[PDB]
Amino acid sequence: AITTAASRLGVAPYNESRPVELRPDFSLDDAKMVIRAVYRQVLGNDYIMDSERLKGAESLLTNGSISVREFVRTVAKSELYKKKFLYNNFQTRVIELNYKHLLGRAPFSEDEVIFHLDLYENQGFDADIDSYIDSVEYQENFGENIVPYYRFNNQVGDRTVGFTRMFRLYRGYANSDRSQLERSSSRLATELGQNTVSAIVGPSGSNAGWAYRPSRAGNTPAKALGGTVPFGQASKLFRVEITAISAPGYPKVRRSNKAVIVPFEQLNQTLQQINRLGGKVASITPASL
Amino acid sequence: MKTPLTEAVSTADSQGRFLSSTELQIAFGRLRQANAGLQAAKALTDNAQSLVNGAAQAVYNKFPYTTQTQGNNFAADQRGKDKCARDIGYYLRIVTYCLVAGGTGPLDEYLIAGIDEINRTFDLSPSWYVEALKYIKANHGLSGDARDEANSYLDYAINALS
Amino acid sequence: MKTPLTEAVSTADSQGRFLSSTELQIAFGRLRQANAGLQAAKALTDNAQSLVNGAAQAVYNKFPYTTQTQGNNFAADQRGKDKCARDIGYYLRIVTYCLVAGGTGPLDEYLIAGIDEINRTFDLSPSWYVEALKYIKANHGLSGDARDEANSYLDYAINALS
Amino acid sequence: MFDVFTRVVSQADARGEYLSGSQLDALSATVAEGNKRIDSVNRITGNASAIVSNAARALFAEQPQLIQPGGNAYTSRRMAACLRDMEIILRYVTYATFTGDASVLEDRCLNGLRETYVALGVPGASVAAGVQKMKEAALDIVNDPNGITRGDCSAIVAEIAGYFDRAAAAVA
Amino acid sequence: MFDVFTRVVSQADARGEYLSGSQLDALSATVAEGNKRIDSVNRITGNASAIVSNAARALFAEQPQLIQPGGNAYTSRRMAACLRDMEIILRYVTYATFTGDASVLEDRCLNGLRETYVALGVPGASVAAGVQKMKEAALDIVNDPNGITRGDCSAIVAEIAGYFDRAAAAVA
Amino acid sequence: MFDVFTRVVSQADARGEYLSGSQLDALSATVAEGNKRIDSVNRITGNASAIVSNAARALFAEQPQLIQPGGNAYTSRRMAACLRDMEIILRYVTYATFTGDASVLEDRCLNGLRETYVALGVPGASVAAGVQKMKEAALDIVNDPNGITRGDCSAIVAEIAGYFDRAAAAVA
Amino acid sequence: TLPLIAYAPVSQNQRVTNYEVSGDEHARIFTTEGTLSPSAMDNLIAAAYRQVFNEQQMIQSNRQIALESQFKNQQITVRDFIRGLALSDSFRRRNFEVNNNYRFVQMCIQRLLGRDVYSEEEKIAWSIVIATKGLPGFINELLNSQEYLENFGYDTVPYQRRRILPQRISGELPFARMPRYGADHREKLEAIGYFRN
Ligand SMILES: *[C@H](C)[C@H]1/C(=C/c2[nH]c(/C=C3N=C(/C=C4\NC(=O)C(CC)=C4C)C(C)=C\3CCC(=O)O)c(CCC(=O)O)c2C)NC(=O)[C@@H]1C
Ligand SMILES: *[C@H](C)[C@H]1/C(=C/c2[nH]c(/C=C3N=C(/C=C4\NC(=O)C(CC)=C4C)C(C)=C\3CCC(=O)O)c(CCC(=O)O)c2C)NC(=O)[C@@H]1C
Ligand SMILES: *[C@H](C)[C@H]1/C(=C/c2[nH]c(/C=C3N=C(/C=C4\NC(=O)C(CC)=C4C)C(C)=C\3CCC(=O)O)c(CCC(=O)O)c2C)NC(=O)[C@@H]1C
Ligand SMILES: *[C@H](C)[C@H]1/C(=C/c2[nH]c(/C=C3N=C(/C=C4\NC(=O)C(CC)=C4C)C(C)=C\3CCC(=O)O)c(CCC(=O)O)c2C)NC(=O)[C@@H]1C
Ligand SMILES: *[C@H](C)[C@H]1/C(=C/c2[nH]c(/C=C3N=C(/C=C4\NC(=O)C(CC)=C4C)C(C)=C\3CCC(=O)O)c(CCC(=O)O)c2C)NC(=O)[C@@H]1C
Ligand SMILES: *[C@H](C)[C@H]1/C(=C/c2[nH]c(/C=C3N=C(/C=C4\NC(=O)C(CC)=C4C)C(C)=C\3CCC(=O)O)c(CCC(=O)O)c2C)NC(=O)[C@@H]1C
Ligand SMILES: CCC1=C(C)/C(=C/C2=NC(=C\c3[nH]c(/C=C4\NC(=O)[C@H](C)[C@H]4CC)c(C)c3CCC(=O)O)/C(CCC(=O)O)=C2C)NC1=O
Ligand SMILES: CCC1=C(C)/C(=C/C2=NC(=C\c3[nH]c(/C=C4\NC(=O)[C@H](C)[C@H]4CC)c(C)c3CCC(=O)O)/C(CCC(=O)O)=C2C)NC1=O
Ligand SMILES: CCC1=C(C)/C(=C/C2=NC(=C\c3[nH]c(/C=C4\NC(=O)[C@H](C)[C@H]4CC)c(C)c3CCC(=O)O)/C(CCC(=O)O)=C2C)NC1=O
Ligand SMILES: CCC1=C(C)/C(=C/C2=NC(=C\c3[nH]c(/C=C4\NC(=O)[C@H](C)[C@H]4CC)c(C)c3CCC(=O)O)/C(CCC(=O)O)=C2C)NC1=O
Ligand SMILES: CCC1=C(C)/C(=C/C2=NC(=C\c3[nH]c(/C=C4\NC(=O)[C@H](C)[C@H]4CC)c(C)c3CCC(=O)O)/C(CCC(=O)O)=C2C)NC1=O
Ligand SMILES: CCC1=C(C)/C(=C/C2=NC(=C\c3[nH]c(/C=C4\NC(=O)[C@H](C)[C@H]4CC)c(C)c3CCC(=O)O)/C(CCC(=O)O)=C2C)NC1=O
Ligand SMILES: CCC1=C(C)/C(=C/C2=NC(=C\c3[nH]c(/C=C4\NC(=O)[C@H](C)[C@H]4CC)c(C)c3CCC(=O)O)/C(CCC(=O)O)=C2C)NC1=O
Ligand SMILES: CCC1=C(C)/C(=C/C2=NC(=C\c3[nH]c(/C=C4\NC(=O)[C@H](C)[C@H]4CC)c(C)c3CCC(=O)O)/C(CCC(=O)O)=C2C)NC1=O
């Protein structure tokens, strides 16, 4: 599991939280807790007012007229889910949102986006939502009676790209998917088309450099192609991701977030210049071998 | 680390060119001296325990004050003597690494870089390790090109400490 | 202007350090190559006139248009032929300089640096000098150790011009 | 970077042990292979421009989609980039042959080349085909028996083939 | 970057209000505690090398895995970097004690320290244990009665302990 | 910079002809002399710190006005600067012995050192005296017959002496 | 090591605050912070070559091919590319080997910090940085210098700073004028046998 970095990455409130399962002869507070867990997960921790509470699907779940899987399906078919996530977003953003909500994980490969977008355009949003719900992964993870939940831990049949893209999608326990730095932009278009992985930046509070997002162009690549040769005498190279540089000003600082590859011997100086600048280090990744 | 081959490649590669005749005879000198270096490393590996114990005894003879008076930085008790033997074993092992590699690169990235703050922070006199390396110079038992390669790494550690 | 000795000294100066055993091995390879390099340079010094004349004739045989059409860059007149023989003599003399020095440094500071603008400004084809150095490779008459050392500089000027 | 000596020196330092006798005999065997290694480095260095030019010409003859108008090797800047990519890959193969260890080829040549080629749209399969053409050209030049003393040289040829395999695998 | 007055200034300006009488009286009490604050800074500064050396010795007696070969504190370069990190963390704890606010500590020392230590493979719990040993040495040296006029110094010492705990928590 | 080969090469190129036969024989005699040259370089490098320490001790014992208060070698920064100056001069003397030519010594160490010492107030006569004491120590350790095969090294000793004399004349 | 010996600053135009609009005689900012075309990246690389090597050593043999290729891919910043130009073999042989430490300090301060040396004392102070730390140590000191940063930072090609004042036809002499070597290496080349007729 995730133990040491759980507090930093926000995994710990989901580490001590067990999956919510409705028993076959369930109590009323069990149905209410399934309702609350579904409204937190499927609607992505958005604030839900009483006007949009979806009383019909709640009432069908409360007497067992529908299951938890059918309740998740109903609240994903609803106009509230569509106006939260579908109508004002790119289709890749919608696909990764449905993956985070209904399956609790980030999309793995480009082929999943291909399948879901082709099925949406071929058969619409409801058909696509049904495909997330009627997936083998949904049954081996949640089935019929368990509310979907975020799956940060390693399971059978996952991919390690999904672990990094999960924190590209999950931005903290105090956070909703609509309330993130890319306001409507899909976070995995350049990560799934290029099949690349950006470094995991944790949420706010625990991580001072929480606000690093990469630009659409002019980004330093992750691996140092070249090694120590442009830097003279060096041993190891590290990509430092730096957030919120504002001490010199606009002529000097054009971009708040800067990613640079620096050696060991320049590491102290680089760290010192970040501190002097007032910048925040998001992550440091070993760029060379 | 710093060897003839890695300096040749790093030179030709910071220059951004193929390996010319200069780097090729750098490799030729490496092959010319490397067999004697490996034999010197084999002999020092064979005599390492006796050389380290004799070097420690030479330190305790020239500098007897590390044996009587107390303190963490001295070898009065058993654990100070154990750490002194470990330090001299480190020195001799990196000398064997330098004889294998063909340069003071193992000494630089393993022992020489940082040893000044080692001797300053923990109050270790560098003259102790100087006398240990002079005892290794006295009784390593090598002759010819194996002797001058071994003595060059020892005196490189002498000149860094002194 | 790079040799094994100058590169070794400039490297140890770049770290600001004394000459370790790596630099001594570099000089060892320089010594073991230098006698064959000087013998090759002496043999090319003896055969220089016939080598330049034959190389120029091979260039005019492979490229007859240099001796047929008019132009400043061509060898149709005596002035162009004298310039071509002077050029090939420069190539052979700097190859002997590389053989004496033990590295491509005489080529890199005397002929290779800026040769593209030489060939581009004055409309000289690098393939002419490639054919001349290929004749020098074919008929230098050296064998064994001095052959591979001399052909290293000759092929280095081939790879620079092509 | 590491060579054939500092690789086992670094393993011995991480293990905290001296070099064992079998390691010293293996290093003596590499010393015995070293003259043949120097000949291989000298031959690829001497014929490097011919290897790069002939491999590029064979690659563009076999794959005209690179050099077509709109292609990835189209115009002067992209062609110069492709030719220096062959030049650099051949140079680091000679470097790894020289050191006897792929650490210079792993770190200073191929660490991030596939991701760079994917990001630019460079076809890594065509680069791999060009690396295989440099493989066959360089191995034909090293295995040329004329003008050199005879001897068994299959080990250094297999090492160079492994370095070229590593260069071809790391681009696609 | 803030000190004990500048933090209150920034909070009051972010609220857009003058400092209330309670805040002015709290800062006056801080000015009263300032002489003991200067004494604590002076004592840790004057015994910094003793704190770093004794904390390193206690840490590597408790954790001999670091100094054995194959360990992080093994070799003079890595141990020199380790002792440099010990004195750097002690230096910024003294800076935070001097300022009365931990903005210099969390902004100029612990900024990216855990990312650096994870990327280097530096054991952050070992650095945290060394920071706790520096904490024990520093709160022993500051609480020494001899050589200084007596008085109650619970608050400044608790503030120093809080600085050491947020230094250890930022690397763990 | 030049070496013993490239000095001859540069003179032959500047005059504009090939090397003569006798010039090649002189260079071959230098090549035969090179093993004793490498021995002298190795000995000076191996006892460089002893040379600098003993020569500085004898220099500040022969003339005490440099280490007197108000003197140039007074203060720890200026004393470390003087020891470092002797270290550097001995290093470039070793470099010039290695190359077989005084080009690295004259170009890198001795070019403009006199006016720099005049502008700093550094006494160049005392620097020349320290260089002469390093000459005495270096010629003592090069001509030491112990631990080496016997042979005549008069030209190497004279070359090191000439390098030291032109180092002492460049500051006096 | 040792701390640099103190040198007094001599008044130069870059010391005072610039009360100007950039206009005609401003040195153009060659920066990678804005996303550039490959042509604009090529002119930026040529500007770095013109600053470090001057116009004369812009030849194909002095082009750092792998450094250019890494710089295009943004593996390195502009400051690291300037370092690689200063650590280049051609720069070391052409400029560093033909000069003493004093004139090389003056050359590197002019071509990296964009300002002249204050006096002979600054050349003296950084020449021992050369003599102990090598050329890489010295270049690194100059490139980590706050001056280099507050002026050019990490992503701008260095330029001569405040060469000419507003409404002045002429100002300070351009840095391009300074030769690879001074009169000492000139007369040493004359003494070895060159340059005579
Ligand atoms: C047709 C004129 C050109 C062309 C198209 C092409 N497109 C793709 C792939 C994708 N296109 C999209 C676009 C959208 N996603 C959305 O959500 C929306 C609005 C709702 C749009 C318009 C996406 C997401 C993809 C990725 C999924 C997929 O691969 O199908 C491809 C295939 C991508 C590939 O190269 O593998 C192609 C070929 N190609 C052309 O040459 C024409 C210029
Ligand atoms: C104005 C309507 C709003 C506002 C602005 C505000 N901006 C900053 C700071 C910065 N702005 C930039 C922007 C750019 N970098 C570029 O390269 C370009 C185009 C070339 C632009 C436009 C940058 C780099 C900074 C930081 C550096 C600097 O200080 O100049 C601030 C200051 C924030 C701070 O000091 O931390 C502010 C206030 N603020 C508002 O409230 C309006 C909505
Ligand atoms: C001979 C193979 C063919 C040929 C040659 C030709 N060359 C030139 C002119 C020049 N050649 C050089 C070359 C060098 N100068 C150097 O200093 C060095 C390094 C030592 C080299 C290699 C230069 C600089 C020139 C121009 C300056 C000059 O005239 O000396 C010419 C004349 C070109 C002209 O326009 O005047 C010719 C004809 N021509 C052939 O047809 C042969 C096949
Ligand atoms: C014509 C005047 C003479 C001639 C030409 C010839 N050219 C080539 C090969 C190449 N030419 C280029 C040039 C460009 N490629 C570009 O992308 C651009 C910018 C848009 C230019 C100017 C290139 C890259 C090649 C090589 C790759 C390829 O084959 O496409 C050849 C073939 C060389 C070969 O070895 O295969 C020839 C013959 N030849 C003549 O005799 C004419 C006098
Ligand atoms: C005394 C506690 C112990 C002792 C001392 C001892 N010191 C030296 C030599 C030197 N000391 C210095 C120190 C300074 N010089 C300075 O300018 C300053 C700053 C003002 C300081 C601190 C220096 C430079 C020397 C060497 C030069 C010189 O001789 O003046 C020696 C002599 C060493 C020698 O080899 O000649 C001694 C003996 N020795 C002890 O046993 C005491 C325990
Ligand atoms: C030729 C076989 C194929 C080809 C090549 C091509 N490559 C590039 C661009 C780059 N190549 C590299 C690789 C390296 N740079 C280094 O320094 C090193 C190690 C020292 C390596 C391995 C890089 C970094 C680039 C980008 C930077 C640059 O442009 O120099 C291009 C240009 C792509 C573009 O449009 O920008 C091309 C065309 N292309 C082919 O089609 C062949 C299969
Ligand atoms: C499908 C391929 C795949 C891989 C490879 C993978 C790696 C992987 N290793 C993890 C954790 C881990 N891995 C280790 C491993 C080690 N700790 C050490 O000290 C040793 C050096 C080392 C053993 C060699 C540890 C200790 C954790 C748990 C970290 C934590 O507690 O937070 C996790 C966190 C998720 C989880 O544990 O459930 C992942 C995803 N996940 C995948 O899907
Ligand atoms: C872990 C427990 C937890 C926290 C802390 C939390 C915070 C939280 N506050 C939110 C929104 C919000 N919060 C505010 C609050 C304010 N606006 C103001 O002007 C005032 C200064 C302030 C009240 C004092 C507003 C206005 C929004 C809605 C923003 C919008 O939809 O446009 C949202 C967005 C989703 C939603 O609207 O439900 C979250 C997630 N949510 C949580 O589950
Ligand atoms: C500075 C330029 C220079 C170089 C590069 C050089 C290399 C060199 N290669 C050698 C041997 C050799 N080279 C080879 C190589 C091969 N044999 C083959 O049939 C294969 C085609 C080929 C592999 C590419 C062999 C087998 C030996 C003899 C075994 C050995 O000496 O290791 C020798 C021993 C002396 C001799 O017998 O010729 C030298 C000096 N000498 C120089 O002065
Ligand atoms: C591989 C490179 C390398 C070197 C060289 C090295 C040296 C080294 N020697 C040390 C200690 C020590 N070294 C000695 C040595 C001696 N005391 C004496 O009286 C004798 C005269 C003398 C032996 C010649 C002692 C007593 C200590 C313990 C100091 C202490 O605990 O305070 C320590 C302190 C950490 C520890 O206790 O292990 C280091 C790092 N460490 C390294 O990683
Ligand atoms: C801005 C303030 C600042 C911080 C925070 C800082 C931390 C810092 N510690 C480092 C290394 C290091 N730190 C340690 C420390 C330790 N190893 C252990 O085993 C112990 C648990 C521990 C000491 C108790 C070691 C061993 C290295 C070197 C790692 C290596 O060389 O691979 C490095 C890498 C660069 C270098 O070595 O100089 C940095 C930047 N440097 C700064 O300037
Ligand atoms: C420039 C160097 C310098 C310093 C640092 C300095 C500090 C200093 N500390 C003082 C007091 C003091 N210092 C302490 C501190 C303590 N008392 C204890 O029993 C604890 C062990 C300890 C906490 C670490 C106390 C209690 C006072 C008296 C109360 C006060 O003046 O604030 C005083 C008041 C004068 C006096 O009574 O001595 C000064 C001037 N003066 C100087 O010239
Ligand atoms: C990498 C370290 C290393 C070095 C430096 C080295 C030097 C070295 N010096 C040699 C010879 C020699 N060295 C000397 C030198 C001298 N004779 C004297 O009586 C004078 C005191 C002194 C001048 C300083 C002489 C005379 C020879 C024999 C002649 C010759 O080989 O050139 C030899 C030939 C083999 C031998 O007979 O020992 C070698 C290999 N070998 C190595 O492995
Ligand atoms: C933008 C205004 C400007 C100009 C024009 C200028 C000229 C100039 N010409 C130089 C060299 C040179 N200039 C020449 C020119 C000639 N040599 C001859 O024999 C012919 C008479 C003449 C050709 C017409 C040569 C050959 C060199 C090379 C000197 C050398 O590098 O050794 C150099 C030094 C090269 C360097 O530092 O790398 C400069 C600065 N400086 C400036 O600021």
UniProtKB/Swiss-Prot annotation, chain A:
SMART domains: CpcD. The keyword Membrane applies. Keywords: Antenna complex, Membrane, Photosynthesis, Phycobilisome, Thylakoid. Gene3D superfamilies: Phycobilisome linker domain (1.10.3130.20). InterPro entries: CpcD-like_dom, PBS_linker_dom, PBS_linker_sf, Phycobilisome. GO terms for cellular component: phycobilisome; plasma membrane-derived thylakoid membrane. Residues 1-178 form the PBS-linker domain. It comes from the Bacteria. Residues 235-287 form the CpcD-like domain. It is a peripheral membrane protein. It is found in: Cellular thylakoid membrane. PROSITE patterns: CPCD_LIKE, PBS_LINKER. GO terms for biological process: photosynthesis. Pfam families: CpcD, PBS_linker_poly. The keyword tRNA processing does not apply. Belongs to the phycobilisome linker protein family. Part of 2 PBS rod complexes, the conventional CpcG-PBS rod and a photosystem I-specific CpcL-PBS rod, both of which include ferredoxin--NADP reductase (petH). CpcG-PBS has on average 3 stacked phycocyanin hexamers (PC, CpcA and CpcB). Linker CpcG connects the PC stack to the thylakoid, the hexamers are linked by 1 copy of CpcC1, 1 copy of CpcC2 and the stack is terminated by a single copy of CpcD. The CpcL-PBS has on average 5 stacked phycocyanin hexamers (PC, CpcA and CpcB). This is Phycobilisome 32.1 kDa linker polypeptide, phycocyanin-associated, rod 1. The gene is cpcC1.
Swiss-Prot record, chains B, C:
PANTHER family: C-PHYCOCYANIN ALPHA SUBUNIT, PHYCOBILISOME 32.1 KDA LINKER POLYPEPTIDE, PHYCOCYANIN-ASSOCIATED, ROD 2-RELATED. Light-harvesting photosynthetic bile pigment-protein from the phycobiliprotein complex (phycobilisome, PBS). Phycocyanin is the major phycobiliprotein in the PBS rod. (2R,3E)-phycocyanobilin binds at C84. Pfam families: Phycobilisome. This is C-phycocyanin alpha subunit. It is a peripheral membrane protein. One of its GO terms (cellular component) is phycobilisome. It is found in: Cellular thylakoid membrane. CDD domains: PC-PEC_alpha (cd14770). Keywords: Antenna complex, Bile pigment, Chromophore, Electron transport, Membrane, Photosynthesis, Phycobilisome, Thylakoid, Transport. Heterodimer of an alpha and a beta chain, which further assembles into trimers. The trimers assemble into hexamers, although these were not seen in the crystallographic studies. Part of 2 PBS rod complexes, the conventional CpcG-PBS rod and a photosystem I-specific CpcL-PBS rod, both of which include ferredoxin--NADP reductase (petH). It comes from Synechocystis sp. (strain ATCC 27184 / PCC 6803 / Kazusa). GO terms for biological process: photosynthesis. Belongs to the phycobiliprotein family. Contains one covalently linked phycocyanobilin chromophore. NCBIfam families: phycocy_alpha.
From Swiss-Prot, chains D, E, F:
GO terms for biological process: photosynthesis. The keyword Membrane applies. InterPro entries: Globin-like_sf, Phycobilisome_asu/bsu, Phycobilisome_asu/bsu_sf, Phycocyanin_b. It is found in: Cellular thylakoid membrane. It comes from the Bacteria. Heterodimer of an alpha and a beta chain, which further assembles into trimers. The trimers assemble into hexamers, although these were not seen in the crystallographic studies. Part of 2 PBS rod complexes, the conventional CpcG-PBS rod and a photosystem I-specific CpcL-PBS rod, both of which include ferredoxin--NADP reductase (petH). Interacts with rod linker CpcC2 via the latter's N-terminal PBS-linker domain. Belongs to the phycobiliprotein family. This is C-phycocyanin beta subunit. It comes from Synechocystis sp. (strain ATCC 27184 / PCC 6803 / Kazusa).
Curated annotation (Swiss-Prot), chain G:
Disruption phenotype: No visible growth phenotype, decreased energy transfer to photosystem I. Decreased accumulation of phycocyanin (PC), but no major effects on the phycobilisome supercomplex. A double cpcG1/cpcG2 deletion has even less PC. No change in state 2 to state 1 transitions (i.e. energy transfer to PSII). Keywords: Antenna complex, Membrane, Phycobilisome, Thylakoid, Transmembrane, Transmembrane helix. Coiled coil: none annotated. Residues 10-188 form the PBS-linker domain. The keyword Transmembrane helix applies. It is a single-pass membrane protein. It is found in: Cellular thylakoid membrane. GO terms for biological process: photosynthesis. The keyword Transmembrane applies. One of its GO terms (cellular component) is plasma membrane-derived thylakoid membrane. It comes from the Bacteria. Its main location: membrane. Part of a specialized phycobilisome (PBS), a structure that is usually composed of two distinct substructures: a core complex and a number of rods radiating from the core. This protein is part of a core-less PBS rod (called CpcL-PBS) with on average 5 stacked phycocyanin hexamers (PC, CpcA and CpcB). Linker CpcL connects the PC stack to the thylakoid, the hexamers are linked by 1 copy of CpcC1, 3 copies of CpcC2 and the stack is terminated by a single copy of CpcD. Ferredoxin--NADP reductase (petH) is also part of the complex. Belongs to the phycobilisome linker protein family. This is Photosystem I-associated linker protein CpcL. The lineage of its organism: Bacteria, Bacillati, Cyanobacteriota, Cyanophyceae, Synechococcales. The gene is cpcL. The chain holds residues 2 to 198 of 249 of the full protein.
